[PDB]
């Protein structure tokens, strides 16, 4: 799943 | 939930030149970090931001040294995002003329995390580094770095100008090192954690979906 820069 | 955000950018020299047909990785990742900072700004998410604009022509870091933790200027520590930080990103940044390692900046941001994420309550951490892989770096603490990233629950992502699907042998070996590092973080799936910059634009242009817990 999208994480960090995307979460 | 809570999260800590520490964005790591390079202000070196290589990104100061690029193909005329495509925007420089400097300005490209600049718009990216600008559009991304806007994202966590509008959403009232309690995520805290710190910035590392490494590759600095000077050195303004808590871990200043002659060669250890060098050429680093933390824009601001790990607190809530706010506008003036975005504006100061938009204005204060300046093209550089030096070249500096990122693994150094990785450890510096790591130390900021360990020095602050226990000082105040958090639940999970990220570490993001934007660079062009034009650094002279040694693989010394990589095992230890990945170790205590696992221990402190810090997720590392890299963002590179080239696309997985013409770069220097320096850039190519850095990419292979990066693949090694990401697999050493999670495993084979570490390939997905590789990110280019145009894809960052495509995947990020939208504003933050207004999530809501029921």
């Amino acid at each position: 799943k999208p994480r960090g820069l995307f979460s | 939930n809570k999260a800590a955000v520490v964005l790591c950018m390079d202000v070196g020299f290589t990104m100061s030149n690029s193909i005329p047909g495509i925007e420089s990785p400097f300005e490209q990742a600049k718009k990216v970090i600008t559009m991304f900072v806007q994202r966590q700004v509008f959403a009232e998410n309690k995520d805290e931001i710190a910035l590392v604009l490494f590759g600095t022509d000077g050195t303004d870091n808590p871990l200043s040294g002659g060669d250890q933790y060098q050429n680093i200027t933390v824009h601001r520590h790990l607190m809530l995002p706010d506008f003036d930080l975005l504006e100061d990103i938009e204005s204060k940044i300046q093209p550089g003329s030096q070249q500096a390692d990122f693994l150094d900046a990785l450890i510096v941001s790591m130390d900021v995390i360990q020095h602050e994420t226990i000082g105040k309550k958090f639940e999970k951490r990220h570490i993001e580094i934007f660079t062009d892989l034009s650094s002279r770096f040694s693989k010394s603490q990589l095992d230890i770095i990945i170790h205590s990233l696992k221990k402190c629950d810090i997720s590392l992502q890299f963002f590179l100008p080239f696309s997985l699907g013409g770069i220097t042998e320096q850039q190519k070996e850095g990419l292979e090192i990066v693949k090694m590092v990401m697999i050493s973080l999670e495993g084979e799936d570490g390939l997905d954690e590789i990110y280019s910059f145009s894809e960052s634009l495509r995947k990020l242009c939208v504003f933050k979906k207004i999530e809501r817990h029921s």
Partner: protein
């Protein structure tokens, strides 16, 4: 029909000594039957169609009052919008003591002439000023021959009644009750629009229904545009609305007057009065404050000129029912704006229905509104039961949801059932069937609110305290299913609650 027009029903009861006291048995009374009918329909109309018109006028009476000072006709209350101060008047007459009052105020029942009676009612409908949508007259008599004696009166009657039929007025009598004498071919086959001693048509006029209605009012007419050049004229109509209670009105203690709210906005630093220009809108983000013009706080929404934007078409399996957003609306061309467009509407409808595929579009209901994505799922007409409209033919409007709506669910794992208990649950689900008709139920809230309204209005001894189908009939479920609850307990239930 003409919308501002209104539905008007005049009431007309045989006030002779004929049925004032027939009372063959001791269970009802024809006047007490008609008055009950009038009271019931009138209170139903109160809530139902508060804007309509009613009037009650008795004939054959001994006292006299009407517009034209005729003989033996008494206009109890003229044509006017329904109101309590009239239900009170009618109630004054409901009862044995009530009928004593009725007889000793206006008369036992003198001679009469339905020719003249219809004259009277005609003048009544004429006198009103507002426009009338439907005009209907209800006799309440039983002397199935108005008069077999003076035929000339009968000729005059048929003549005038034909006239009223021609002046735009309908007429209807419900044959209430007579010993024998329960026929309509005697003098009325040519009046109203086989036969027995009591009228079914008067039964429902006691059904006491109390919803409310609005006519064929277009919610909004917008121009469906296929492309930037072809446009058609569609009327976004509405077919389910969730009636909230009528909004209350604020009144003074000492006098029950309207109180005319006067909210305003004014300064705290000084006793000034901020006029609407002198205000600003604001938000707080990122520890920094924001200003926009009040004009801008709505300018921040201008997205498309009003209308519908059909883009493509889509396979009806994909429009998943799983993601309803707001009540659907209905689509049907309005020939008024773009002449002939009804053709293209029909074309789209026929062809889409034939090829079993949706039609997606952008909906901007009014100016200043962001657009949503709505699908024009076509609908075929159905009439079969009695060749009356059931589902009107055209397109629906299933609003399709936006990403900001999915509301990510707190994932949990699945555990399949064993075919044994599901095989028995087949029997359980079979047993408790029931056909669900659309208008099955009522709001207990709306219904009870309306009730309590009549209660307080009419100084009743009691609220009606309606019993409403919403609550389940518990014993029915306990019985018709049998003790299978213990079966599924022993199948798929251990000791813990």
């Amino acid at each position: 029909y003409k919308y501002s027009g209104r539905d008007s029903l005049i009431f007309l009861v045989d006030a002779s000594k004929a049925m004032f006291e027939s009372q063959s048995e001791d269970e009802l009374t024809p006047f007490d039957m008609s008055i009950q009918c009038i009271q019931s329909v009138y209170i139903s109309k109160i809530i139902s169609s508060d804007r309509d018109l009613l009037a009650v006028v008795f004939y054959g009476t001994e006292k006299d009052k009407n517009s034209v000072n005729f003989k033996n006709i008494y206009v109890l209350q003229e044509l006017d919008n329904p109101g309590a101060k009239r239900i009170l008047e009618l109630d004054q007459f409901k009862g044995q003591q009530g009928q004593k009052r009725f007889q000793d105020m206006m008369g036992h029942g003198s001679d009469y002439s339905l020719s003249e009676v219809l004259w009277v009612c005609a003048n009544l409908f004429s006198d009103v000023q507002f426009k009338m949508s439907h005009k209907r007259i209800m006799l309440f008599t039983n002397e199935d021959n108005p008069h077999g004696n003076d035929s000339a009166k009968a000729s005059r009657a048929r003549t005038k009644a034909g006239d009223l039929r021609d002046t735009g007025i309908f007429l209807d009598l419900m044959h209430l009750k007579k010993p024998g004498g329960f026929d309509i071919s005697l003098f009325y086959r040519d009046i109203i629009s086989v036969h027995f001693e009591e009228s079914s048509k008067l039964e429902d006029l006691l059904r006491k229904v109390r919803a409310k209605e609005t006519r064929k009012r277009a919610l909004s007419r917008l121009k469906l545009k296929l492309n930037k050049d072809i446009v058609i004229s569609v009327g976004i109509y509405n077919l389910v609305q969730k009636a909230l209670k009528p909004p209350p009105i604020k009144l003074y203690r000492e006098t029950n007057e309207p109180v005319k709210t006067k909210t305003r906005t004014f300064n705290t630093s000084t006793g000034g009065l901020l006029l609407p220009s002198d205000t600003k809108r604001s938000q707080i983000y990122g520890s920094r404050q924001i200003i926009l013009e009040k004009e801008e706080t709505e300018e921040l929404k201008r997205f498309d000129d009003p209308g519908l934007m059909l883009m493509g078409f889509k396979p009806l399996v994909l429009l998943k029912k799983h993601h309803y957003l707001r009540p659907s609306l209905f689509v049907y061309p309005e020939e008024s704006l773009v002449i002939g467009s009804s053709t293209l509407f029909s074309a789209l409808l026929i062809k889409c229905l034939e090829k079993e595929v949706a039609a997606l579009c952008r909906y901007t209901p009014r100016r200043n509104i962001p657009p949503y994505f709505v699908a024009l799922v076509p609908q075929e007409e159905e009439l079969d039961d009695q060749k009356i409209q059931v589902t009107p033919p055209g397109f629906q409007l299933v609003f399709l949801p936006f990403a900001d709506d999915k509301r990510k669910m707190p994932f949990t794992e699945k555990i399949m059932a064993t075919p044994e208990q599901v095989g028995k649950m087949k029997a359980i689900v079979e047993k408790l069937r029931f056909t669900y008709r659309s208008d099955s139920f009522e709001n207990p809230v709306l219904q009870q609110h309306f009730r309590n309204l009549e209660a307080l209005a009419l100084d009743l001894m009691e609220p009606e305290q309606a019993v409403d189908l919403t609550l389940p009939k518990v014993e029915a479920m306990n019985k018709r299913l049998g003790s299978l609850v213990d079966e599924f307990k022993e199948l798929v239930y251990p000791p813990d609650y």
